[PDB]
Amino acid sequence: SGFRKMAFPSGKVEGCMVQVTCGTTTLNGLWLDDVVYCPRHVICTSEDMLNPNYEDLLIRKSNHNFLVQAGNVQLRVIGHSMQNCVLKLKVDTANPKTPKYKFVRIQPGQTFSVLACYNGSPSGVYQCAMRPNFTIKGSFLNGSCGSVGFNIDYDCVSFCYMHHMELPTGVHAGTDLEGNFYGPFVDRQTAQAAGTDTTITVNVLAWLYAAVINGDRWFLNRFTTTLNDFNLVAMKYNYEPLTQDHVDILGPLSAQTGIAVLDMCASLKELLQNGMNGRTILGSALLEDEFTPFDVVRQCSGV
Amino acid sequence: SGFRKMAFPSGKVEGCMVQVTCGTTTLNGLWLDDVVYCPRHVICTSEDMLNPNYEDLLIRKSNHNFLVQAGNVQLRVIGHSMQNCVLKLKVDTANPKTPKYKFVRIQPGQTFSVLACYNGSPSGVYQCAMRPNFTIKGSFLNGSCGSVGFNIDYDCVSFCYMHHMELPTGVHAGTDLEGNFYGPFVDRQTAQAAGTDTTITVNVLAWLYAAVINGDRWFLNRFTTTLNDFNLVAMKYNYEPLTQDHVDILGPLSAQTGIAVLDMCASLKELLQNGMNGRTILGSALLEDEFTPFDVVRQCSGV
Ligand SMILES: *[C@H](O)[C@H](C[C@@H]1CCNC1=O)NC(=O)[C@H](CC(C)C)NC(=O)OCc1cccc(C(F)(F)F)c1
Ligand SMILES: *[C@H](O)[C@H](C[C@@H]1CCNC1=O)NC(=O)[C@H](CC(C)C)NC(=O)OCc1cccc(C(F)(F)F)c1
Ligand code: NA
Ligand code: NA
Known part of the structure; x- marks a missing residue:
């Protein structure tokens, strides 16, 4: 675990x-x-x-x-x-280490690994989520441009990000491997700002399921709510609306835990209204939204 | 940044x-x-x-x-x-991909990368700190034993950890590559518990320096304290005592920021007494202690 x-x-x-x-x-x-x-x-x-x-x-x-x-x-x-x-x-030489690969463009709310490189030499690896405002919260110094983001599936590398720049707020922006920017940004030194961001609700719920699977239960309650009533609370706290597709994608985690999605939504509602009161969930004192349902299932199915 | x-x-x-x-x-x-x-x-x-x-x-x-x-x-x-x-x-075959390597044993408070593997196939990479109680907070399912932890320095891999087991609290225990356990643990299925843990003070201070370098300044103040007076507060909050060697190792970060170590210690004292009051530092609502001074300098010297 x-x-x-x-x-x-x-x-x-x-x-x-x-x-x-x-x-x-x-x-x-x-x-x-x-x-x-x-x-x-x-x-x-x-x-x-x-x-x-x-x-x-x-x-x-x-x-x-x-x-x-x-x-x-x-x-x-x-x-x-x-x-x-x-x-x-x-x-004039084909890279003999070329893996099976695809160029894919990812959606806001999805995650990928970043291999940070300098002078063609890899220096570090970490996970990023594509924010709703099409930025990522990375760690990039001068010389890191051309570092890429990727996911791996059965020895096929799906490249989804190439790094180009840092915005004034310290977040990062780049393109897919077709050279098309994520978000309304351009590759020049001007006045560029990311739009307002929102919290990725389906990811927060996935992480709460990860917490339960790992023994964190203090935030659970006997209540359930409706999808429309939950989305009213989501709007107030700058969370994305929960769709039926999101409920379906959380199905496996709800099955493994026996906690219906709308049951977990009641817990999130109370966490948003009351906070944590000095407690933590999976080592965090904030609600984490950068883990997808897939990311959670990857680590939690065996538990 | x-x-x-x-x-x-x-x-x-x-x-x-x-x-x-x-x-x-x-x-x-x-x-x-x-x-x-x-x-x-x-x-x-x-x-x-x-x-x-x-x-x-x-x-x-x-x-x-x-x-x-x-x-x-x-x-x-x-x-x-x-x-x-x-x-x-x-x-009967020497591994043709054998890197330059060393077997090193690490100290509590130091970090390393874990390559989580199943059936001889790598599945994920993440950072761990060796806790003062000689456990690590990992992510390991059945089949992960033999996964290793390592640091890399100029294409030399220093192996420091091999994974053996999970304790009842969900934390993880293993050996160096000489087969000697970290901590008072044995490789059998019995009743084993980790001793009480403490917070790695020099690492918290390193992370506060990382925060300043990245523009988080709300916790700073004009006060300075003494080493002995700070260690009184450290004892009360289950933090390790700060040594002069720790002050010396934080020298570069204090130089880059212009904030003396005992100046930063006053900030930590106030954070420990008052909390954060709804604010965050580098995206966390808790004081983080799993980044070494080296880890911070690796990402923050360019800023
Ligand atoms: C390419 O290596 C570089 C990556 C930046 C540098 C700092 N952090 C990053 O992610 N990209 C650029 O420098 C980019 C180039 C233009 C699009 C042509 N411009 C840019 O990011 O300017 C913003 C910025 C912010 C802080 C520090 C820098 C500095 F490092 F260039 F000084 C730049
Ligand atoms: C080796 O792959 C395995 C790694 C454990 C399994 C779950 N998480 C881990 O880190 N090590 C063991 O199974 C170990 C073997 C003894 C030292 C001989 N025993 C062990 O960890 O038992 C504790 C435990 C806790 C939760 C789940 C398991 C299970 F997965 F084995 F069921 C074991
Ligand atoms: Na509930
Ligand atoms: Na101060």
Whole structure:
């Protein structure tokens, strides 16, 4: 037993990380087959980054302006193109460590592992949730751009995120691997703000089920509520509305615990109104919303 | 910026995980050069596990009783020996993916990454701190024994933990890679309890420095205190005493922030007496003690 925020093992992605240099800018790239993917802002300069025309910038580049390094071995670039906000550098060697992979775009409320990298070298792994406002709460320093987010399913890596920037509030923004931003953001140094966020209700309920499975029961009660009455409380506390689909996805956890979803919703209602009164749930004194039902089932089915 | 609990990239350890089967018991082993290390309780049966004599149990085994599998490829065992609570199975192939490594024993208050594995296959990575009472707060199901904990330093893996069991409170216990338990525990199914725990004061202070570096300042104040006066408050709240060595290790963080350690200690004193009053620090509503000064410097020096 135990419930811990847990990343996927990063080995399959570590074998894909390279370093991409253009001019005096160095960041990370993702080397799959004979193509390296990286943020297109690597071709910007200190003065371009205010409002650059990337099509003009790329037309003025040649293959020899791109220094790619897989460890010590330099990779020769034989072509370059832009796909939305990602640059694709064709190289003369197919990555022999290329895993089975997909490029997927994820939904707000879903989680993924981030492999934070600097100079093409992995440094750390951690879990992120895509917030309703399309930001993530990461840990990224200068040099981390091109770090990717991913999930793994039966040795197939589904890449869903490439890191591009930090917003003024300290949260992070990036693209899918097609180069399309998550959220209403652009890859330039301007005044950008994330919209207001909300709490991911189905995830909070999944985590309360994780808590029960691990022996935290103090917040339970004999009451049940209705879906419409719960969504009234959700609106007041800036929680997302609970849908019948969410109730269905929580079915397995409700079955394992014998606690109906609308039974657990009554507990959440009371936690929102009364707080915790000095107690904790799974080691937290706040309601946690960054664990999906899948994340919980992954760790709690055996218990 | 940002501060996130972060594991080391797990690739170097993934390449060392195998599956070890003896009888009807399957767990994980660590394959380094031509030796596989795993918990010796793999040679126990359902009735042996109450109070087994492991020396007798191993004398009655032969090499062919041990099924080792590195993925699909079965590894042939050519020798077996016991070192304290770990079994060493000699195999006829040196692991070609063996990293540079050390076996180190860690101290209470220090952290490490855990690569949770089942059937020799890695499933997740997360950070743990060795508690003062020599337990860890992990996430381990049946089949996870033989999963290891490690730190990485310049492509050298320092292995410090192998998982053996779960205590009645749900926390976890294991050995170093020499087979010596952390804490006053034994590898059999009996009545074992962890002693009382305490809070790791130097780690809480390191995390408060991380908070300041990331823009959380609401808990700061103009006051400073003395080391002896702070340790009086530490005793009352079940915190470990602060030593001058701890003050010295926090030197870099105090320099980066301009906040003396005894200045930060006054803030902790007030947090312990007054609580947070509905506010959070780095996304937590509790004082976090599982980040070492090293962990903080790793993520916060660039900010
Ligand atoms: C790419 O490595 C970098 C990643 C940033 C740096 C700090 N944290 C991150 O996530 N991305 C950028 O620097 C990005 C580039 C423009 C889109 C062209 N701009 C950006 O994030 O500016 C915001 C910012 C905030 C704090 C610190 C920095 C600094 F590190 F660049 F100084 C930048
Ligand atoms: C080895 O894979 C296993 C790891 C345990 C199982 C559940 N969580 C863990 O960390 N270790 C044992 O099963 C261990 C073996 C003895 C030392 C010989 N015994 C043990 O942990 O018993 C406690 C326990 C608690 C909850 C659930 C179990 C169960 F999974 F075995 F049923 C065991
Ligand atoms: Na209820
Ligand atoms: Na102070």
